[PDB]
Amino acid sequence: QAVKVFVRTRPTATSGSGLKLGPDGQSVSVNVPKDLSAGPVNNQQEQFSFKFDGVLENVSQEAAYTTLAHEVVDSLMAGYNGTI
Amino acid sequence: MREVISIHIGQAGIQVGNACWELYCLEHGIQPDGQMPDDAFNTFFSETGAGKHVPRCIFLDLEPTVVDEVRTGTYRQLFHPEQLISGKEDAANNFARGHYTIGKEIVDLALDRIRKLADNCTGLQGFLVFNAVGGGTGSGLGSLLLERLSVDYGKKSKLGFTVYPSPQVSTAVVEPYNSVLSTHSLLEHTDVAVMLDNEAIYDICRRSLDIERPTYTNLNRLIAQVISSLTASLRFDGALNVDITEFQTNLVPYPRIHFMLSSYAPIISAEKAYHEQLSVAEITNAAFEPASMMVKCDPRHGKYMACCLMYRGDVVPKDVNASVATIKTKRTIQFVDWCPTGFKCGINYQPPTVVPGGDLAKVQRAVCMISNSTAIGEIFSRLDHKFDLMYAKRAFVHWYVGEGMEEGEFSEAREDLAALEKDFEEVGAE
Amino acid sequence: RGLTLVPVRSEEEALAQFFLGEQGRTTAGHVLNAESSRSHTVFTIHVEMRTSDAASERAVLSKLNLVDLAGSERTKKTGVTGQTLKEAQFINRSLSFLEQTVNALSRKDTYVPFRQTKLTAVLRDALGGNCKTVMVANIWAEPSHNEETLSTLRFASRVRTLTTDLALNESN
Amino acid sequence: MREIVHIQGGQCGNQIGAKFWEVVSDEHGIDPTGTYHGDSDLQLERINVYFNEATGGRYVPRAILMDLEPGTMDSVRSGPYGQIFRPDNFVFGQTGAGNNWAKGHYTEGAELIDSVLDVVRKEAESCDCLQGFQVCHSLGGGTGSGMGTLLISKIREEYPDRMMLTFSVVPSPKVSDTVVEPYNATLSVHQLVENADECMVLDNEALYDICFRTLKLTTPTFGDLNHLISAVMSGITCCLRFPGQLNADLRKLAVNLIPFPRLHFFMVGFTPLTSRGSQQYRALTVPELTQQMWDAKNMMCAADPRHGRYLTASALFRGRMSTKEVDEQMLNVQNKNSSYFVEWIPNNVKSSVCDIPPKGLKMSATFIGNSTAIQEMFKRVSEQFTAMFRRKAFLHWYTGEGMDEMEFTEAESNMNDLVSEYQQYQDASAE
Amino acid sequence: MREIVHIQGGQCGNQIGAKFWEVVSDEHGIDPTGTYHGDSDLQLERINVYFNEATGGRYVPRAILMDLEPGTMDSVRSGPYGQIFRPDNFVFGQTGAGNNWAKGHYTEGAELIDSVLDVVRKEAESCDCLQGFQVCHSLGGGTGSGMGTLLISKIREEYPDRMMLTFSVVPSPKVSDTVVEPYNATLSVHQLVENADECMVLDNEALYDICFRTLKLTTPTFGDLNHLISAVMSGITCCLRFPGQLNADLRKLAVNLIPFPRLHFFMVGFTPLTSRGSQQYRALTVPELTQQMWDAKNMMCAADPRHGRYLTASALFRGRMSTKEVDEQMLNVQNKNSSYFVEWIPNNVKSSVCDIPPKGLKMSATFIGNSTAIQEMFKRVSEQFTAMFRRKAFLHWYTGEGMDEMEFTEAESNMNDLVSEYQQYQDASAE
Ligand SMILES: Nc1nc2c(ncn2[C@@H]2O[C@H](COP(=O)(O)OP(=O)(O)OP(=O)(O)O)[C@@H](O)[C@H]2O)c(=O)[nH]1
Ligand SMILES: Nc1nc2c(ncn2[C@@H]2O[C@H](COP(=O)(O)OP(=O)(O)O)[C@@H](O)[C@H]2O)c(=O)[nH]1
Ligand SMILES: Nc1nc2c(ncn2[C@@H]2O[C@H](COP(=O)(O)OP(=O)(O)O)[C@@H](O)[C@H]2O)c(=O)[nH]1
């Protein structure tokens, strides 16, 4: 009955400088680059980490559906409601 | 040769600009009609062939009432009518309104007029931006204008004489919100920000000027005297000349830390004047008294990093050096360990002029002490919980979001002031 | 009320109705996305069960809302008021109301208002009620998109606090 | 240059608007023939907010009067300031709405609404910059409430971003005028919640209490109540019309007052309300004005704020005054009555100052308080609405006008949701 | 020195022309005896456009009054300005056409058309330069519509390049005067499409509505309707007679108005039409005149522009005015109502300005809009014509006048073709 907050990342065909990482498929971390000019050794904010119910770095739509809403649709046919 | 461009944004900026320009006109002898019956005016006025001097200022507001009061008042023939810029719809205490939707065209026009002003100055010491942190015009438009100025002009010294909301007393409700937003905005653009609190200036007026009913005109007169003392070394010669560019290098240890306490002395009415000697040492002691600070921030909590002293009038270097030596030897005043010098002394031979009808007395000596101290982190600490207290249940957030802002913007601003708190603690700690 | 509920008995007409919706929805040009979706679209699949014996036993009352919200624009690139900024403000307000509802649900306060926007009104049963919700957070990793990515991640993290009910509601 | 379009609806709304225009013309020094006779520059400085200039020196109000019966606007035109209004801005039907919100919103208001919007658009497009519209009317009336809500919905559709201000006379708690007041009020509150950006709740019984206890009048007619309401409607926007030390327009008041969009119903009051006997005996000071301001009796809404919690409260002061005095007084009020003030808002005060007090008064101040006390007014109206709706009393009159029975239930649900909304922020705790 | 030959046809046409000549003589300062009493050089500067000088100081209109019964002409001559017309320009029959288009076009029209053409030629040859002919009459009448269509065809044959202007009073939508109005109108429209280069459509009931609503008259006779029609008829050519900051003659208006030759029917309007009561109250400004101009109620035609789409719109302003003001106002109108304006024409504005306003009015403006809205009028007249022709009611007179039944079907076919073209250009999209 829990909320399963999944995350899906857009595959950058231009392949920009990607800072996100996934170590185990559960946690995602972003490292904002500290501004060297603005207050040297006087900023203290670089890392932001979060934990979710799943991350999808680069998957096909079939895999995305299988891991995203299969259980919810099954619940719908089992009489439960669902919302994606 | 030493021109300084003045910007006055929002009601508070314009209403302190009225006091500022009254003071400058009286100080240079310029009549309110525009012309006066060498070249000390060039820092603030540009003279035309007919003899009429027009001030290098820009009165920006999204509300018509404040600017039309100037257009109808005595100084209607002084300021350039195209320099007076008025909007149609007020920002409504909405930083998003003054920064995203209404402020766009107005800041474009303001940039055009400022470019016309700056093309008229051979040298350019910097900009004096006068706003009030805590209002959509002052916060939003001030931040937008400062961002554009940093982008285009670049390295010019931008001195923001901002009025921050008082700790307990206040006049707005979303004031913590737009104050945090504007603080995030101007943390990276203004070069030296001077903090002012209405509460502290009210205490100054009540205790020293003995005004039981202080008002905005009195507050603005005090602020204008501070600004004139700051700029005195631009217009009038004296021993220990100081410049706007010297302020940055002698006051800002690290770029993030550029918010400054300001304190004037003496603040005495005519009745109590000429009752005390008002010597250099005594006026310096008064200037470093925690009561005379124009921010509700006790300096005893923090540690002074730098103290720039601006003396005006009959002041001798021997007395100033003896006074500052006594200040250093005093135990209550405490400096950081990594700043043994911590003092930027400047004197000037032009005493501050008195505005007729004001409460300030004609004193032959004056001190403007501007200090960078880690104590100022206290005010940021107050605003940081006043913000998150309402932000916990998203009070008034729909208003700001309705003008093209996002919850991410609020989160980013809160994180940035938290980072500023950490910066103050870090620089304070050994 | 007043929503045209279309019965479906084969896959092809379901596809046809959905693609008709795809045509009809409002999309506008934008710098980040060539055809940005400027409207929160909601495609609800209503399932009405009936047993193998059927004959009026354990029927109806099942739902599945597939919702594609509109993007949260910084409103510093759009600029143009020509139905690109004026509607962006509405999108941002709806998203902020949704996030405030999420905050109140995470705090588990008593009433957690849902009427402040049509989005929360539609998703009133969802995000609470008796519905299995699974939020999707589409992010874009770019050197300058970090701020927007972090906003999305913070919203998703605060959403993860929630947990709803699952009742086998059937027809009345 | 920030204009306001005034609209009057129904008998009560039209009378209130007539009195309001009389007061505004008096304060601007305009005689009933339209010529300015004030001999002061500031009066004509911002006259364009409320008036337009005709070919001569005449100044006509930017007002639009609606009614379904012509008798009320015949009385308005026969009134002392009846000739200033545009002859084209009198819009009337033929048969009045028999205190029937359904008639005033669906059957009979539908035909007149096209003419009303035509006149409103004509007035609004003429404006250089439009702050918004203000609609004065009464909840619990057929043409008043019905056409007011319908017009407010239409104007919201046409001008979403423009300010909408409403002065609604909520039916009184103790003594009711019409029997179907709960029905009309419940149906109208549903529209006001969704459409009106800013709403002022007024009760005739609260006005009677204020005029009998503070003004100490003996025979207070409806003229006096309309005069007090008109004084407040002037005081709310004097910052638009006159120079102020710290000015605040309608949108600024709305932003600083409304924490959440649905909680836009405000109880308001005017100071200094002094009896004739003690006029010389009262001392005009800002502390006295604030003390009278924060009294529950001064409120023109029936609900007393002591029961609820002040979400926010704005005070627009008028006169040559010390901002230090004003700010200190209201901070002191907040500190002393912190129990009645919301904790999760550090400062519940929006203080504004204008430099031009109303004529005769050295100082004045209008108060606009958003408090959860209005919960009890909504609750009482629901206690009456449910009692009538369970037995469907008078429901056939509304049903025969082509309004579904489901609409009553939906409106009641919305109103009770608002009640619980107020309760949640009444007993919500910080952190 | 660009002359216009005015012709009045039928009873309605003769009355309208008499009012038109009275208005023009008043504007040029001509007394009923013809002597110039104007005390203004500009009045005589271009008096030759409409009038001719006699041996003395008398001035004779270039008008021809043609009719089959002498009663209307006797009334016109007994009227206040009946003596200006040359007695030879009264061409009358002896037996009138009984509201029968067949009688007015075939049986009784053949004999009098020779004298009519002779008088037309005599008046035209005297002119130095001939702008063209203007014929005032009403659709839905025997002699009116008949003489109009036949004379317009003959003049088209004689002077193909000369401008042809028609003022046709189309039968009113809801209340008709004669029974055979749909028949006569359908027969006349077929001729006006083919022959008349430029035509104005007027409706008695649109006239009634505008005079009862904007003018707010209580018992306004046909004289007032003729007065307003005459004001429009004067304003359409005041550019020819008076100096203009941006002048535009009849052919310029025709070229800028008519996109395709068959779509030459136009609805007109005049501003400022102000009620006597609110004359002092309204503001005489260019924005005000434009706002009154673009109102559907101010349009003199029954068809309202909201239903259709504006192909083009010309506005002839009169008075000392800012060309920037006029152009900005009309561009703003187009921007606002772009939904009602045709997309494949980037600018639907043809603004002309004249320096001499009408007497009494400081400024004025006449409007000429080519919009697809007239489609609904053509459709209504067709709905009446088809209903009558299905049962061949009243068809026997038209049969007995030597006019074939196939002519009715041909006229209906062409009229429905015009309806189809209006729909096609209404729903035609760019690219
Ligand atoms: N020191 C000082 N502060 C002032 C004065 N006038 C206003 N303020 C402060 O300025 C703040 C708001 O300034 P503004 O933003 O310019 O107000 P505004 O002109 O209505 O513009 P917006 O509120 O942004 O729409 C208030 O919170 C006051 O505390 C003044 O005369 N002196
Ligand atoms: N303040 C005030 N209230 C009035 C006045 N006249 C009527 N009311 C109140 O307005 C309420 C509704 O009446 P109203 O809406 O005007 O009737 P309607 O116009 O036919 O819809 C009644 O309960 C009256 O108490 C007045 O002159 N002043
Ligand atoms: N404006 C105006 N219209 C008129 C007048 N007299 C008649 N009409 C209209 O003209 C229409 C046709 O009449 P008409 O053609 O003149 O009759 P005929 O002369 O016998 O052909 C009728 O529907 C009348 O409504 C008048 O004096 N003024």
CA distance B307 to E324: 60
* Contact call for B and E: 3+ CB–CB distances under 8 Å: no
Alpha carbon of D340: minimum distance to chain B alpha carbons (Å)? 17
Positions of E strands within B198-303: 259-265
Q: How many helices (H) and strands (E) does chain D have?
A: 15, 12
Mutate to test the interface with A, among C105, C136, C165, C169 (most CBs of A within 10 A): C136
- The closest alpha carbon to D127, from C172, A70, E291, B397, belongs to E291
Determine, for residues A45 and B415 on separate chains, whether the beta-carbon distance falls below 8 Å: yes
Count Cβ atoms below 10 Å from residue E74 Cβ, excluding itself: 13
In C14-131, the DSSP E strands lie at: 27-28, 36-37, 41-47, 62-68
Q: For residue E382, report the phi and psi dihedrals to the nearest 5 degrees.
A: -65, -40
Q: Is the dihedral of CA B241, B247, B249, B251 positive or negative?
A: positive
Largest CA distance in chain E: 62
A75 in Cβ contact with C169 (< 8 Å): no
User: Of E203, E137, E190, nearest to E165 (Cα)?
Assistant: E137
Q: Does the bond joining D272 to the residue before it have cis omega, within 30 degrees of 0?
A: yes
The data reach a resolution, in angstroms, of 3.5
Strand intervals (E) in D62-145: 63-67, 90-92, 129-138
Coil vs helix vs strand at E125:
helix
Instruction: State which amino acid sits at residue A5.
Output: V
Task: Kindly identify the ligand whose nearest atom is closest to the C-alpha of D188.
Answer: 2
Find the catalytic residue in B47, B147, B246, B421. B246
| Separation of alpha carbons D312 and D342, rounded Å | 8
Residue D340 and residue D310 in contact, taking contact as beta carbons nearer than 8 Å: yes
E379 phi and psi, to 5 degrees? -65, -45
Are E282 and D55 inside 8 Å of each other by CB?
Answer: yes
Q: Is the CB of B160 under 6 A from ligand 1?
A: no
For chains A and B, CB pairs below 8 A equal: 29
CA distance D60 to B1: 55
Q: Quick one: tokens of D44?
A: 């004509």
Q: How far apart are CA B112 and CA D220, in angstroms?
A: 60
A8 in a labelled binding site? yes
Cα first-last separation, chain A: 13
3-state SS assignment for residue B159 = strand
Specify the ligand 2 atom closest to the Cα of D172.
23
For E155-306, strand residue ranges (E) read: 163-170, 198-203, 265-271
Q: How many CB atoms lie within 10 A of CB E414?
A: 17
Instruction: Annotate D237-249 with three-state secondary structure.
Output: HHHHHCCCCECCC
Q: Which two tokens stand for residue B15?
A: 């209403």
**Partners of residue D370 on adjacent β-strands:** D312
Strand partners, A8: A56, C138
- Sequence-ordered alpha helix ranges (H) in B29-88: 64-72
CA dist., res. D353 & res. D367, Å (int): 12
- List the single residue in D243, D261, D344 with the smallest CB-CB distance to B389: D344
Point out the ligand 2 atom lying closest to the alpha carbon of residue D176.
23
What are the backbone angles phi and psi of residue A15, rounded to the nearest 5°? 60, 60
Alpha-helix residue ranges (DSSP H) falling in E93-174: 101-102, 109-126, 142-158
Active site (annotated) includes residue B246: yes
Chain C residues in contact with B409 (beta carbon < 8 A) = 74
User: Do the bridges between strand D265-271 and strand D364-371 make them parallel or antiparallel, or are there none, so unpaired?
Assistant: antiparallel
Alpha-carbon gap: A54 to the closest alpha carbon of chain C (Å): 10
Radius of gyration (C-alpha) of chain D in whole angstroms: 21
What is the C-alpha to C-alpha distance for residues E221 and E224, in angstroms, rounded to an integer?
6
E247 is annotated as contributing to ligand binding: no
The single-letter code of the amino acid at C83 is Q
Query: Do the beta carbons of residue B59 and residue B68 sit within 8 Å?
Result: no
Question: Taking the CA of residue A38 as centre, how many other CA atoms within 13 Å lie in the half-sphere pointing to its CB?
Answer: 17
Q: Residue B424 and residue B379: Cα distance in Å, rounded?
A: 11
| C-beta of residue B375 within 8 angstroms of C-beta of residue B302 | yes
Q: Which of B100, B397, B411 sits opposite C75 (nearest CB)?
A: B100
Reference C62, options C166, C135, C136; nearest CA is C166
**What would the two tokens of residue E3 be?**
């002359």
- Main-chain dihedrals φ then ψ at residue B301, nearest 5 degrees: -70, -40
Q: How far is the CA of D112 from the centre of ligand 2 (A)?
A: 20
Taking the C-alpha atoms of residue D100 and residue D106, their distance in angstroms, rounded to an integer, is 10
Environment class of residue E427 by beta-carbon count within 10 Å: exposed (0-12), middle (13-18) or buried (19+)? exposed
- Residues of chain D neighbouring B72 (CB-CB closer than 8 A): 41, 45
CA dist., res. D317 & res. D314, Å (int): 10
Per CB-CB distance under 8 Å, the chain C contacts of D424 are: 109-111, 113
Answer yes or no: are the C-beta atoms of E317 and E354 closer than 8 Å: yes
Which atom belonging to ligand 3 lies closest to the Cα atom of E104?
Answer: 21
At position E264, the amino acid (one-letter code) is: H
Question: What token pair was written down for E266?
Answer: 């136009």
Strand bridging mode C36-37 / C27-28: antiparallel
Dist CA D381 CA D406 (whole Å): 18
B64 interaction partners in chain D (CB closer than 8 Å) = 1-2
Q: Inter-axis angle of helices D250-257 and D222-241, to 10 degrees?
A: 100
CA distances, D72 to each of D17, D91, D200, E414 (Å): 12, 11, 23, 54
- Alpha carbon distance B380, B418 (integer Å): 9
Question: Quick one: chain B helix, strand, coil %, rounded to 5?
Answer: 45, 15, 40
CB D140 within 8 A of CB D104: no
By C-alpha distance, the chain D residue nearest B400 is D255
Q: How far is the CA of D131 from the centre of ligand 1 (A)?
A: 20
Identify the chains in contact with B, defined as 3+ C-beta pairs within 8 A: A, C, D
> B407 vs C103: CB contact, 8 Å cut-off?
no
Q: Is D98 exposed, middle or buried (0-12, 13-18, 19+ CB in 10 A)?
A: middle
> Does the CB atom of residue D168 touch ligand 2 within 6 A?
no
| D423 in contact with chain C, both atoms CB, cutoff 8 A | yes
Distances (CA, A) of D208 to B260, D200, D212, E268: 55, 17, 6, 57
Say whether A10 and C130 touch across the interface (CB within 8 A): no
Chain B residue with minimum CA distance to D131: B89
Query: Which ligand 2 atom is at minimum distance from the Cα of D143?
Result: 21
User: Which residues in chain D have their CB less than 8 angstroms from residue B404's CB?
Assistant: none
Residues with CB under 6 A from ligand 3: E 10-12, 15-16, 99, 138, 140-144, 169, 171, 177, 204, 222, 225-226
Which residues in D lie closer than 8 A to residue E283 (C-beta atoms)? 52-55
State the alpha helices, DSSP H only, in E28-95.
Answer: 41-45, 70-78
Beta carbon of B15 within 6 Å of any ligand 1 atom: yes
Provide the residue type at B321 as one letter. N
Q: How many angstroms away from the CA of D344 is the closest CA of chain B? A: 6
Residue D310 Cα, gap to closest chain B Cα (Å)? 13
